Amino acid sequence: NEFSIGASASLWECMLNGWLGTLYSAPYNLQFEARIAQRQSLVKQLHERQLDLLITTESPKMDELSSQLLGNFTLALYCASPAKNRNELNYLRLEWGPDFQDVPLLTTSSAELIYQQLSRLNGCCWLPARWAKEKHGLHTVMDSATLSRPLYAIWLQNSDKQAQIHEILKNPIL
Amino acid sequence: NEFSIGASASLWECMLNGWLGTLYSAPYNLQFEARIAQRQSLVKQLHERQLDLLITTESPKMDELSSQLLGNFTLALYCASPAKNRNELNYLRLEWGPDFQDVPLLTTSSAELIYQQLSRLNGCCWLPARWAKEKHGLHTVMDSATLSRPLYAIWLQNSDKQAQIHEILKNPIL
Ligand SMILES: [Cl-]
Ligand SMILES: [Cl-]
Ligand SMILES: [Cl-]
Ligand SMILES: [Cl-]
Ligand SMILES: [Cl-]
């Protein structure tokens, strides 16, 4: 049946859509579900055998789960203009997981949504640098560091699809 | 504090991002959360006062909830080529709610994800016609009807923010 991969809207938009595209020419024949849901729902679904694979930047409680570190990607603080300091902007919140972090004018889990809004909310937000570089009108905020996130695959250790999980994770995301 | 609006990834991508943009120049001062989550989580969150407003194409069980019909939008079956019949294509599944509907090669809740994938999966899928028209390389499948969905606002009838819900719903989405 369908192999389900779950992740936040921003991971699908910024990196997993390309990776999923490569799985259709991999040496096997599968149908896929690209599931977009909140972290607590996806983690519960792994335990209930309702989700096959979770991709995330933070490992959850690991009892009865397995994890594999896939890589690491850079994160920078972007705005729509050059030469701006953070105190001249509205800090918008793109969700990056519980451990990553005035009320923000906008909070969301979609990088594309926060990118569209940033140009009309005098905004800045933390975005994946590789994805942000191919957008127009993004400039790093001057008083800011380059940060990063790890990327993990999480699955049920006793999953009935451990064989297919092992082969899918041979295709690199980063 | 933040006013939370919840909807599927596809409603945010196809129509609610523009609507949210108009709320920042409305005659009031609010900060917003554009929440993307699965239907069962958003409905539970309304009941638990964790979500202020749900936008959806299908009314859930309505005990202790209120609803307002906002409008109706057309849905057509699109593929990447002119003059194709559905039996020449791979039918991909974009989620449209429990009542809307071979294993599909792809199933997702993001219209942008299914649009990117459609060009490499010989695919067709049901997309909002207004949004699809501004994309390049989409053509309606020849043997297919134009369908539609209603658009509803759902909220907790006894919400402590009924006043702000009433004013937000005065800004038209469609
Ligand atoms: Cl995730
Ligand atoms: Cl969810
Ligand atoms: Cl994540
Ligand atoms: Cl929805
Ligand atoms: Cl919906």
Author numbering:
A (entry chain A), B (entry chain A): 45 to 145, 156 to 228
Share the article's original sentences.
Here, we report the deposition of 14 structures of enzymes from both the core and accessory genomes of sequence type 23 (ST23) K1 hypervirulent K. pneumoniae. Targets were selected using a shotgun approach aimed at uncharacterized metabolic proteins from ST23 K1 hypervirulent K. pneumoniae. In silico multilocus sequence typing of all K. pneumoniae isolates was completed using Kleborate. This analysis showed that 64 of the selected proteins are part of the K. pneumoniae core genome, defined as genes present in at least 95% of all strains; the other 132 proteins are part of the K. pneumoniae accessory genome and are overrepresented in the highly virulent hvKp clonal group CG23, which contains ST23 (7).
In all, structures represent both metabolic proteins and possible transcriptional regulators.
